[PDB]
Amino acid sequence: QESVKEFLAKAKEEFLKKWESPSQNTAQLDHFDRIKTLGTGSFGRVMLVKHKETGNHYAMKILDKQKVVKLKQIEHTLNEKRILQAVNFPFLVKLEFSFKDNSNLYMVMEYVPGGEMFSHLRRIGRFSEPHARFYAAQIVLTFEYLHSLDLIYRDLKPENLLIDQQGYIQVTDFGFAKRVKGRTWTLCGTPEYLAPEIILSKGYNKAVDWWALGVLIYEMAAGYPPFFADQPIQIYEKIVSGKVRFPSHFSSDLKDLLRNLLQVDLTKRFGNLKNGVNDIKNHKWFATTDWIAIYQRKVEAPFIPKFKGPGDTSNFDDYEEEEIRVSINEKCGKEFTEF
Numbered sequence: 491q492e493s494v495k496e497f498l499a500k501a502k503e504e505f506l507k508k509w510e511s512p513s514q515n516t517a518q519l520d521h522f523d524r525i526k527t528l529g530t531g532s533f534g535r536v537m538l539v540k541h542k543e544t545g546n547h548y549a550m551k552i553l554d555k556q557k558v559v560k561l562k563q564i565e566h567t568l569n570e571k572r573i574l575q576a577v578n579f580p581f582l583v584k585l586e587f588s589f590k591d592n593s594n595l596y597m598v599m600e601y602v603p604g605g606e607m608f609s610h611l612r613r614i615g616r617f618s619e620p621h622a623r624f625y626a627a628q629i630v631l632t633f634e635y636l637h638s639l640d641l642i643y644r645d646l647k648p649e650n651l652l653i654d655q656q657g658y659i660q661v662t663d664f665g666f667a668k669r670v671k672g673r674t675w676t677l678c679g680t681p682e683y684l685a686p687e688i689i690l691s692k693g694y695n696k697a698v699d700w701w702a703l704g705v706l707i708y709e710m711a712a713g714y715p716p717f718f719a720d721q722p723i724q725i726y727e728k729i730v731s732g733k734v735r736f737p738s739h740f741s742s743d744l745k746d747l748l749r750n751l752l753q754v755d756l757t758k759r760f761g762n763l764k765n766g767v768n769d770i771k772n773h774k775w776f777a778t779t780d781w782i783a784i785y786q787r788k789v790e791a792p793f794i795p796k797f798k799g800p801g802d803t804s805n806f807d808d809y810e811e812e813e814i815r816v817s818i819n820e821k822c823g824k825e826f827t828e829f
């Protein structure tokens with residue numbers, strides 16, 4: 491389609507201009523009031539903050555430089571910030587500011603008050619197929635966009651998909667996203683979502699994002715992921731096996747799409763064939779989807795999160811509240827020069 495071709499060509503033009511000249515140092519910590527911790531990790535946290543001069547709310551991701559170094563995440567953190575500052579798409583969380591200080595790296599993103607898709611999925615139990623399809627269509631378009639920029643996302647899972655005021659998805663956490671021309675090799679991602687070629691230590695490509703979409707669609711429609719076990723090694727054995735069982739309530743069209751996304755052989759997997767994303771867009775399970783209307787956000791969403799205003803945190807859960815310390819001395823300055 492000429493409209494899609496011209497759209498993706500312009501998208502790549504605009505991405506590359508920002509890719510080649512990244513923004514840096516666009517605010518500082520004392521411009522914000524800290525409100526609440528929205529989420530934690532082994533080297534970082536995400537906190538709701540309010541910008542003192544404008545009153546606007548943001549989600550500030552704070553990465554401890556020393557912990558980033560210890561956990562071997564330097565390149566990944568530079569990838570995350572350089573990619574986020576360069577992309578622009580209706581279903582990607584926007585990076586509004588970034589900066590660093592003696593101790594931390596900061597990525598200040600738009601705050602999405604509806605919370606994580608994970609919470610809503612677990613609260614409702616499972617999404618109906620139209621509801622799952624509305625979210626899956628947004629992911630398909632977002633991956634069409636990212637892959638056309640030579641980016642692989644590598645962290646698709648319900649926790650990373652936030653629901654905005656209009657019920658649409660905002661994808662967050664680019665910590666594993668990477669620009670790749672061909673294959674890449676890092677072991678990263680959440681076990682339940684990993685494609686076989688990641689588990690098997692093979693060079694892999696964008697096909698791992700399409701596998702992860704199969705897992706996500708299965709999880710949204712069933713309420714639980716297709717491969718689960720107590721130990722990651724047991725999950726991995728299930729993933730590599732080439733078998734899966736579908737609930738009887740799945741439509742025949744859904745099962746067919748999922749067999750083609752959860753294809754163990756990456757050279758046969760939908761999204762990675764000659765027709766690329768069009769094998770997915772043209773699949774019968776998406777027959778009711780108006781791709782343009784989704785992109786333009788003109789479809790009424792199946793679900794609107796309940797919240798009181800732009801600073802409401804009720805859709806996020808409670809975490810222990812810890813200090814944001816900034817050392818009197820600069821840590822790891824050389825390692826993070828490019829940030």
Ligand SMILES: CN1C(=O)c2ccc(F)cc2O[C@@H]2CNC[C@@H]21
Pocket residue numbers: 528529536549551583599600601602603606649650651652662663
């Ligand atoms: C990693 N991540 C974010 O960066 C993020 C971004 C914006 C936001 F409004 C909240 C938010 O927090 C959650 C917690 N888990 C997924 C999220």
